[PDB]
Amino acid sequence: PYPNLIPSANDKPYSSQELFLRQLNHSMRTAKLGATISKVYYPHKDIFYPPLPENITVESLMSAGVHLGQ
RNA sequence: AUAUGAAUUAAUGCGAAGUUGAAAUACAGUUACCGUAGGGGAACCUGCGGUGGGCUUAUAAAUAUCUUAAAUAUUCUUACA
Ligand SMILES: [Mg+2]
Ligand SMILES: [Mg+2]
Ligand SMILES: [Mg+2]
Ligand SMILES: [Mg+2]
Ligand SMILES: [Mg+2]
Ligand SMILES: [Mg+2]
């Protein structure tokens, strides 16, 4: 998982790298608590979750700004 | 009317090797050319207007701004929703 990391001793505080891994553990579990986001555009998803050609509407072409000519 | 000769006479073409000016073609060294006039043996020179087939070849008196910069965007592979 995370080789070549030397933990700290229980007496002494978290180190910077231990803090990083700790907040990663927080980020993957509890940071996303409270609400789910819906109907919001995320730029990366056009690249990794493009729709199928049959599912494209005029509205989604317009929201992408395809209609704006010179 | 028309043809044929004509003394004399005007122009023009060509050719051989040369000869003389420096007018044109470059800003051709006075922008060229068109028209017209005078001068000159002539090339050309000068006056007046016109044209560009010469100047469109045209190219700065200059100064620029504030919001969560990241445990948050940048990662992401049909996922979620
Ligand atoms: Mg000359
Ligand atoms: Mg001249
Ligand atoms: Mg004279
Ligand atoms: Mg005129
Ligand atoms: Mg000229
Ligand atoms: Mg010219």
Curated annotation (Swiss-Prot):
It is found in: Mitochondrion. Transmembrane segments: none annotated. It comes from the Eukaryota. Present with 6890 molecules/cell in log phase SD medium. Component of the mitochondrial ribosome (mitoribosome), a dedicated translation machinery responsible for the synthesis of mitochondrial genome-encoded proteins, including at least some of the essential transmembrane subunits of the mitochondrial respiratory chain. The mitoribosomes are attached to the mitochondrial inner membrane and translation products are cotranslationally integrated into the membrane. Belongs to the universal ribosomal protein uS2 family. Component of the mitochondrial small ribosomal subunit (mt-SSU). Mature yeast 74S mitochondrial ribosomes consist of a small (37S) and a large (54S) subunit. The 37S small subunit contains a 15S ribosomal RNA (15S mt-rRNA) and 34 different proteins. The 54S large subunit contains a 21S rRNA (21S mt-rRNA) and 46 different proteins. This is Small ribosomal subunit protein uS2m. The lineage of its organism: Eukaryota, Fungi, Dikarya, Ascomycota, Saccharomycotina. The gene is MRP4. The chain holds residues 128 to 197 of 394 of the full protein.
